[PDB]
Design a protein around this nucleic acid. Structure first.
Lengths: 402, 542
RNA sequence: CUAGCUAGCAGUGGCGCCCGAACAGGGACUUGA
């Protein structure tokens, strides 16, 4: 081991608090931390360090209770190191594949030592129900999970160990964003699973236990904003469509209501039907054909930040939008208890964004802060944690879809 | 022989060079003797001519007037000292306590001084008059943290010896109990006393263990029950901000456990009060509120402990005026505790406040007990499901059921997601000026109206316009507007807010059985849109 | 070093008041309807 010296930006380490937990989780935390300390991965500490980092418990495919840390603040503060010193590339063929697979090798990170001057910035504590006991603090004497610097430094030995199989499977591509891994596979699903098992054995060769699961990017496309095609058109429908078109004009400059506005020159009732003239129908068909086409005049920038907006329609139907600048959408789609579906939806959207751009965007959820902070751990199943916030939404962007 | 904690100073700093204040000539001997007494015990080192530093000194005669004792202030060093982690940021609660048959408690005097200090850091104890505290001083920033950490690591082996027992520690007292007879309890207490004397602590055998209920933050910790300290109230007419603070703090300490406790009026009575001797005339509302609080307090009540085996229950009995309550019990009438949640966004509804209160109670139960019970809410399912399904957000709650305990909760009106036949179209709009504020607005039929205003904004102009329009319209109507503000506000389906304008809006809306609405742009020539724009812009646009 | 040569510390829980940091809208510079 040659621990690379970690040095935070010449900004102090975080001291965030810890939201309440449950005994059902505290028991699991204690029984896992016992072994973690027995195996020289951690050690008990006192108040000598002022720092502190959130901690929690989780529970697919098993009933175990793993854990991880919220290094969001830590990563946002120590970006430079892993962002510039030892960067990572981002291929593009993975999305053109048939199927993919995601792994998790946190155990591999749990088999390496770590510097001592940086452990103080890894203060992680567990709570005590009813404040009966002071915080049982600990320290990470090894590579932690969720810290994207650990993979940035381990990639060397990781690739050195991966050497054997990749030469035999050149068509396959690999990405190491975080504790999780990815694979490029443009072959049969059966062959995909056979090679996945082969790689699992290649990992077990060094004692790496790793028993949704897979995914397919080919089916992913943009959500075509489509208008209704009826034989009788009332006023209210035309008003809704005109509002939608005016709000969307910021995307497609080729949107006009000249032939339509004329029909509105007459302030009549709502249920009365009006025929769509050929000129009006011509302009409507032109706008429709323009919408289905993709975006023209946009791009992707890895230096700037990303946004991950979300909305809701009803009956468990949700939407999602991604963009760097306002109204510069890079992708859309569809996806259809109320918090479980939201959690899996954000997971799916972030996975899509990562396999496309290799970066985690910022989110905007339409809910209060305490409710999410409390109930997001229930159905969570991943090991990566992005940023987030909370916003109020008007009934205008909702018109992006039905 | 306990092990200390390595401690350093802030980046590139040292001890502050100061001159100790001049003092009297009668406490000096009375405090020099105290210093020599602390020295002889083997707790301080006197090395003056070496340390080039200094610290302040004080002579105090605090409560229990016996003599002028010593005090020191670290206000000049607490900031220079390197930062530390604040461990205890909360406190326990009587509601979250369990059933311990054999209860007890253990305190230690001068325990702060019963812990050594890192000799590299003991140099920063230049107590001139010089004396260098060989142990932890008083008024220190983190000393309680090291204290609790030492206590925890010392009891760790004791916990391993008898993990079945539970301990409730604190600053200096060790609240402990079990579910056995006396003999075994005293045997374990002597074992703990020996385990502690192994490191030099103190414990008598004549303290208060059954003489309780204890005196802890103003509580009554009975053996098989508990409650807050018996409280009283003044019986005069004048009310000064000092007496205010007093009674407010008292009734607040009482409200966290007692039901039917209202302070909103007395709280409102303080907004704007800044002087120190304001004899406020108690408004009739505050007078009757105090009378009712007294009546509720004229009879005592004893809280109940917690049982891990048996589950708990949550229930609410709303009182109105947008204020809420909540009761927690494991059995009928066995109320553990209660509280209050009445915080108001400018606009809000009933189910919103209900959701906020129930999620706050859930967080409280988690931080106290670590779970949530089956809630008992006075509202039927269809209302809540329709609400959270047709709302523009997501709101989830655990299992619960219905309660037939009037008053209840409901939506006093509804909106339609599709136009209706037979209704009348209403192209309405309203604007004003940033200088005159005499905006004109009204409505138009498929008959038009215009009404000037005073000191209003485009938002308020359109609001008052739709108000006056509804004042004359019939039952069914399909209206349209441009201001997303009012539309989005009405979509929340609120029944109470701050501005009385929206209150009259909803009042008039209630009577109207059916209604439809939507949004359209402005300055586009949509039916009556441009017409109303031109009609209202008269004399204010150019 | 706080108050008018004289008296002057901190923590805990609450009652509060002022400022700083975040959120949604309003008034001035630059682009489109």
């Amino acid at each position: 081991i040659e621990t690379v010296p970690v040095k935070l930006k010449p900004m102090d380490g975080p001291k965030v608090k810890q939201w309440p937990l449950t005994e059902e989780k505290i028991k699991a935390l204690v029984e896992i931390c016992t072994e973690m300390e027995k195996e020289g991965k951690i050690s008990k500490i006192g108040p000598e360090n002022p720092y502190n980092t959130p901690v929690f418990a989780i529970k697919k495919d098993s009933t175990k209770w793993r854990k991880l840390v919220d290094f969001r603040e830590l990563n946002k503060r120590t970006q430079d190191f892993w962002e510039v010193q030892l960067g990572i590339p981002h291929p593009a063929g993975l999305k053109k594949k048939k199927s993919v697979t995601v792994l998790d090798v946190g155990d591999a990170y749990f088999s390496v030592p770590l510097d001592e001057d940086f452990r103080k910035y890894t203060a992680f504590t567990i709570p005590s129900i009813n404040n009966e006991t002071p915080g049982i603090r600990y320290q990470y004497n090894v590579l932690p999970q969720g810290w994207k610097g650990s993979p940035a430094i381990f990639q060397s030995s990781m690739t050195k160990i991966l050497e054997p199989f990749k030469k035999q499977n050149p068509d396959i591509v690999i990405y190491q964003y975080m504790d999780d891994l990815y694979v490029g596979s443009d072959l049969e699903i059966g062959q995909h699973r056979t090679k996945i098992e082969e790689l699992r054995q290649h990992l077990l060769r060094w004692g790496l236990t790793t028993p949704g699961y897979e995914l397919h990017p080919d089916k992913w496309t943009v959500q075509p904003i489509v208008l209704p095609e009826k034989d009788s058109w009332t006023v209210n429908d035309i008003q809704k469509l005109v509002g939608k078109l005016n709000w969307a004009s910021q995307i497609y400059p080729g949107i006009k209501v000249r032939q339509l506005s004329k029909l509105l020159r007459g302030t009549k009732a709502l249920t009365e039907v009006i025929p769509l003239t050929e000129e009006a129908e011509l302009e409507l068909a032109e706008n429709r054909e323009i919408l289905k086409e993709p975006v023209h005049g946009v791009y992707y920038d890895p230096s700037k930040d990303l946004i991950a907006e979300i909305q809701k329609q009803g009956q468990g139907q949700w939407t999602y939008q991604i963009y760097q600048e306002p109204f510069k959408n890079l992708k859309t789609g569809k996806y259809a208890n109320d918090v479980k579906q939201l959690t899996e939806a954000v997971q799916k959207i972030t996975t899509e964004s990562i396999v496309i751009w290799g970066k985690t965007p910022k989110f905007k959820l339409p809910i209060q802060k305490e409710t999410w902070e409390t109930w997001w751990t229930e159905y969570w199943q991943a090991t990566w944690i992005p940023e987030w916030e909370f916003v109020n939404t008007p009934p205008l962007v909702k018109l992006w879809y039905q | 022989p306990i092990e200390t904690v390595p401690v350093k100073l802030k980046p590139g700093m040292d001890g502050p060079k100061v001159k100790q204040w001049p003092l009297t000539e009668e406490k000096i001997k009375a405090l020099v003797e105290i210093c020599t007494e602390m020295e002889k015990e083997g707790k301080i080192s006197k090395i003056g001519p070496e340390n080039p530093y200094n610290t302040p000194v004080f002579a105090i005669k605090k409560k229990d007037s016996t003599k002028w004792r010593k005090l020191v202030d670290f206000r000049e060093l607490n900031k220079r000292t390197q930062d530390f982690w604040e461990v205890q940021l909360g406190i326990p609660h009587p509601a979250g306590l369990k059933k311990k048959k054999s209860v007890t408690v253990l305190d230690v005097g001068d325990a702060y001084f019963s812990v050594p200090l890192d000799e590299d850091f003991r140099k920063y104890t230049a107590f001139t008059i010089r004396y260098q505290y060989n142990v932890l001083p008083q008024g220190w920033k983190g000393s309680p943290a090291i204290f609790q950490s030492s206590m925890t690591k010392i009891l760790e082996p004791f916990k391993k010896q008898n993990p079945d027992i539970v301990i409730y520690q604190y600053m200096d007292d060790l609240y402990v109990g079990s579910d056995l007879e006396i003999g075994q309890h005293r045997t374990k207490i002597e074992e703990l006393r020996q385990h502690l004397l192994r490191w030099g602590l103190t414990t008598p055998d004549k303290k208060h263990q059954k003489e309780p209920p204890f005196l802890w933050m103003g509580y009554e910790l009975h053996p098989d029950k508990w409650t807050v300290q018996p409280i009283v109230l003044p019986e005069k007419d004048s009310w000064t901000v000092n007496d205010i603070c007093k009674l407010v703090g008292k009734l607040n300490w009482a409200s966290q456990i007692y039901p039917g406790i209202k302070v909103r009026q007395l709280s409102k009575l303080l907004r704007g009060t800044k002087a120190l001797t304001e004899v406020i005339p108690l408004t009739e509302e505050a007078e009757l509120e105090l009378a009712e609080n007294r009546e509720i307090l004229k009879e005592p009540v004893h809280g109940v402990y917690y049982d891990p085996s048996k589950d708990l229950i949550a229930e609410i009995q709303k009182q109105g005026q947008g204020q809420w309550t909540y009761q927690i019990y494991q059995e009928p009438f066995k109320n553990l505790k209660t509280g209050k949640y009445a915080r108001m966004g400018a606009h809000t509804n009933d189910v919103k406040q209900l959701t906020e209160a129930v999620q706050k109670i859930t967080t409280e139960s988690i931080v106290i007990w670590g779970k949530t019970p089956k809630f008992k809410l006075p509202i039927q399912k269809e209302t809540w499901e329709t609400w959270w399904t047709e709302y523009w957000q997501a709101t989830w709650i655990p299992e619960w059921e219905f309660v037939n305990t009037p008053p209840l909760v409901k939506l006093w009106y509804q909106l339609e997601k599709e136009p209706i036949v037979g209704a009348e179209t209403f192209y309405v709009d309203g604007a004003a000026n940033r200088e005159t504020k005499l905006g004109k607005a009204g409505y138009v039929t498929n008959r038009q109206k215009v009404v000037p205003l005073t000191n209003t904004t485009n938002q308020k102009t359109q609001l008052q316009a739709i108000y006056l329009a509804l004042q004359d319209s019939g039952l069914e109507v399909n209206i349209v507007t441009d201001s997303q503000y009012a539309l989005g506000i009405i979509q929340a389906q609120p029944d109470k807010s701050e501005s009385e304008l929206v209150n009259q809006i909803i009042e008039q809306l209630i009577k109207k059985e059916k209604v439809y609405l939507a949004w359209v742009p402005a300055h586009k020539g949509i039916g009556g849109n441009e017409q109303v724009d031109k009609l209202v812009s008269a004399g204010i646009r150019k």
